[PDB]
């Protein structure tokens, strides 16, 4: 029931600022300390600072200061992080977690993914992969920038043997990557297959039927 | 600032057994309340950290007490008994003695299990996909181990070259094993003028390759 709610993915200029958010849900955030922690893609977790929740003081780690500033709305349950003069060493994941006395280091959110680029974002091209004991059927998620993208299979109703691969980039300096899914063979005229693919930076939201192939 | 070293950058450990892995300090840990100011962490593929153990020794509630920890002055130990599959992922130390709070540099566990064959697909080009100008086919190893693999596309049994590309998952959360994607990609009017398209797998859980094949239009 506690839960932190980070905010979505961005793509930032080169330059600019961004301002991520983390809310409190089942308890107040005045009563915790707020720490943040970067990991850049590939690379190892990083902690920036912590904010004490009740009083607003903050402790960072020199490495960022002039770059981060930590922030907390006692009154609509959020904290903040925000970054300025952003290059792409600032591409990374953002983690917000709390810690409390009791509790320690009990509770993170998701994370934000932030691309710092200045590239205009692509949204996917979503491809069934058709069906040929045990079938494979898949989608191709093809042709976007920045990370991340969200699959799910069924709206999340299937999870048992997917396989979200990977984003590779292309020549071009786009990513495409593939889910796939193996199911009884005995299903394939019976059950319904959906990706269902999300991109924030685009505001792309698709939901492609895999269906057995032709003739 | 405190450095936490984590050594070695990789630790392999056979799914049953036991394994222990090390945080060194720069300075020593110990509070005046006589706490070593030393955490533990797991972050699993795609997921936030997840706290294992509090100030060397404590279990964090809800975790599993095949985890453990020792240590006093600047050498910790994390230990692992009975390694599940789950536990696949990158141990991390962290120090609260002095601001700033310091990470380890990590530690991932890579876990052993035996080989395995990988079963081969192979996907056509959807017709909504041959409708934008561009063709992707696709072949599909699931489940095998270990990683290492060849993947060759042939086009009319002419051999393929520079025209693909390939991604790997991370060892596989229940089976400890990978899955791996190669991806052809030609024009409509290539695709068009070719018949049969095939993908050969080369792996050492096999005792020969594997060729999955179709031919262009017969469904
Ligand atoms: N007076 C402490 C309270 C505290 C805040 C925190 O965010 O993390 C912690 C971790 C610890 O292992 C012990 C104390 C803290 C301080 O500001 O450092």
């Known amino acids: 029931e506690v839960k932190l709610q980070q905010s979505g993915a961005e793509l930032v200029k080169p330059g600019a600022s961004v301002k991520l958010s983390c809310t409190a849900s089942?308890?107040?955030?005045?009563?915790?300390?707020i720490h943040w922690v970067k990991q850049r893609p590939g690379q190892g977790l990083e902690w920036i600072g912590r904010?004490?929740?009740?009083?607003?003081?903050?402790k960072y780690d020199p490495k960022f200061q002039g770059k981060a500033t930590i922030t907390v709305d006692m009154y609509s349950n959020i904290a903040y992080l925000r970054l300025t003069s952003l290059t792409s060493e600032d591409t990374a994941v953002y983690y917000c977690?709390?810690?409390?006395?009791?509790?320690?280091?009990?509770?993170w959110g998701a994370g934000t993914t932030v691309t710092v680029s200045s590239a205009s974002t692509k949204g996917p091209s979503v491809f069934p992969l058709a069906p040929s004991g045990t079938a494979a059927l898949g989608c191709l998620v093809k042709d976007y920038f920045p990370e991340p993208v969200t699959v799910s299979w069924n709206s999340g109703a299937l999870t048992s043997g997917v396989h979200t691969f990977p984003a590779v980039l292309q020549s071009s300096g786009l990513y495409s990557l593939s889910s796939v899914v193996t199911v009884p063979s005995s299903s394939l005229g019976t059950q319904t297959y959906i990706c269902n693919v999300n991109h924030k930076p685009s505001n792309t939201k698709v939901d492609k039927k895999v269906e057995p192939k032709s003739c | 600032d405190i450095e936490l070293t984590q050594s070695p950058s990789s630790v392999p450990v056979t799914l049953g057994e036991s394994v222990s892995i090390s945080c060194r300090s720069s300075?020593?840990?110990?509070?005046?309340?006589?706490?070593?100011?030393l955490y533990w962490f797991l972050q699993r593929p795609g997921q936030s950290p997840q706290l294992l153990i509090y100030?060397?020794?404590n279990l964090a509630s809800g975790v599993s007490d095949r985890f453990s920890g020792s240590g006093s002055g600047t050498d910790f130990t994390l230990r692992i008994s009975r390694v599940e599959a789950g536990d696949f992922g990158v141990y991390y130390c962290?120090?609260?003695?002095?601001?700033?709070?310091?990470f380890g540099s990590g530690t991932k566990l890579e876990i052993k299990r035996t080989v395995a064959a990988p079963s081969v697909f192979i996907f056509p080009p959807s017709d909504e996909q041959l409708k934008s100008g561009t063709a992707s086919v696709v072949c599909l190893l699931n489940n095998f181990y270990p990683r290492e693999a060849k993947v060759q596309w042939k086009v009319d049994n002419a051999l393929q070259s520079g025209n693909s590309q390939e991604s790997v998952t991370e060892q596989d959360s229940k089976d400890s094993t990978y899955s791996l994607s190669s991806t052809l990609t030609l024009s409509k009017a290539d695709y068009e003028k070719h018949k049969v398209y095939a993908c050969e797998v080369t792996h050492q859980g096999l005792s020969s390759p594997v060729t999955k094949s179709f031919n262009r239009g017969e469904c």
């Open positions: 977690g709390r810690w409390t006395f009791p509790r320690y280091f009990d509770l």
């Open positions: 089942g308890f107040n955030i005045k009563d915790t300390y």
């Open positions: 904010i004490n929740s009740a009083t607003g003081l903050v």
């Open positions: 300075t020593s840990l110990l509070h005046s309340s006589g706490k070593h100011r």
């Open positions: 100030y060397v020794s």
């Open positions: 962290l120090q609260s003695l002095e601001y700033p709070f310091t």
